[PDB]
Amino acid sequence: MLTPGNPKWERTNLTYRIRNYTPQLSEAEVERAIKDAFELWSVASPLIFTRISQGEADINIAFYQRDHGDNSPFDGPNGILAHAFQPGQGIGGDAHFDAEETWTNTSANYNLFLVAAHEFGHSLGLAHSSDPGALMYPNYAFRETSNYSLPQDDIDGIQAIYG
């Protein structure tokens, strides 16, 4: 469940910055989605995520449309929802979300919190899992639950890299 080449962060204290927002949600709603997404991984590893509002962070977060400078363009409604780069400097670890998607905080397509949590796995060095119940499973499908926490397969994956 590790990204090929075993690329990992050499530090456990990471910073992130939300570069822009989506008009479909309030700023407060986007911030809460991102915060909870990171909290999923933090409670199962030594990783600490610190938000900054200016300057250069380790993980940049932004909403872009079509061609946006990294040679991996988005494609309008549905299809590619977002993507993130493996651990590293520069664009490494950054996560981009397709601005043409309907972003929600409900079970309707597409829940920001869920897509983000998945993307951050890639930002930390995790590959896709073959376990249909894992956050890192290749296919998106929202499941309403009484309590939202990181599945055991994802826990094993994050621990196998950072302990």
Ligand SMILES: Nc1c(N2CCc3ccc(CNC(=O)c4nc5sc6c(c5c(=O)[nH]4)CCS(=O)(=O)C6)cc3C2)c(=O)c1=O
């Ligand atoms: N495939 C593609 C994309 N997505 C990105 C976002 C994304 C997000 C999630 C998945 C697979 N996982 C789920 O659909 C999913 N995982 C979990 S873990 C978990 C839950 C879920 C879940 O509901 N869905 C809910 C209950 S919980 O107690 O909080 C624990 C796959 C994908 C693949 C693209 O973009 C693309 O092209």
Ligand SMILES: [Ca+2]
């Ligand atoms: Ca898309």
Ligand SMILES: [Ca+2]
């Ligand atoms: Ca970066």
Ligand SMILES: [Zn+2]
């Ligand atoms: Zn991109």
Ligand SMILES: [Zn+2]
């Ligand atoms: Zn993925």
